[PDB]
């Protein structure tokens, strides 16, 4: 609980009780940032238009 709340204080990460009782994290449209026992990963970039 504490670490998910900590992460939340940078970017919007939502949490949902998954049917099996697991703790799923999701981001801002449905990007399941943590689905089950797996996390997605992210990137930094220079903008496509500038």
């Amino acid at each position: 609980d504490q670490l998910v709340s900590e992460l939340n204080k940078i970017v919007g990460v939502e949490v949902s009780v998954q049917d099996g009782g697991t703790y799923n994290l999701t981001m801002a449209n449905g990007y399941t940032l943590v689905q089950g026992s797996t996390a997605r990963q992210l990137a930094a970039v220079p903008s496509s238009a500038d």
Binding site: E14, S16, Q18, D19
Partner: protein, 101 residues
Amino acid sequence: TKDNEWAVYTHDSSDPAATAPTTASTTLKFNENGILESGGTVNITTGTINGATAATFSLSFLNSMQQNTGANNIVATNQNGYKPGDLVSYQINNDGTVVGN
């Protein structure tokens, strides 16, 4: 492509032949009332991996509801398939049955 109706597109992440398709995999039918009208169930197919067979699965969308505007809501993953793996769990239930995790 209409206020109050939806098409759906699917992709297999792991079969290296799975060209992320351009094609409408399914359309979920909605009355203007914002209550799922038809297509609340459909089966779709996976790719084939490592010589083992492709999987083919059923998916359901019951009690979905479509709004005046705003909260485009989905987060869920409910499926009846299992990876093979390890167990160590002995728990003798009051009925006299045993469960394993």
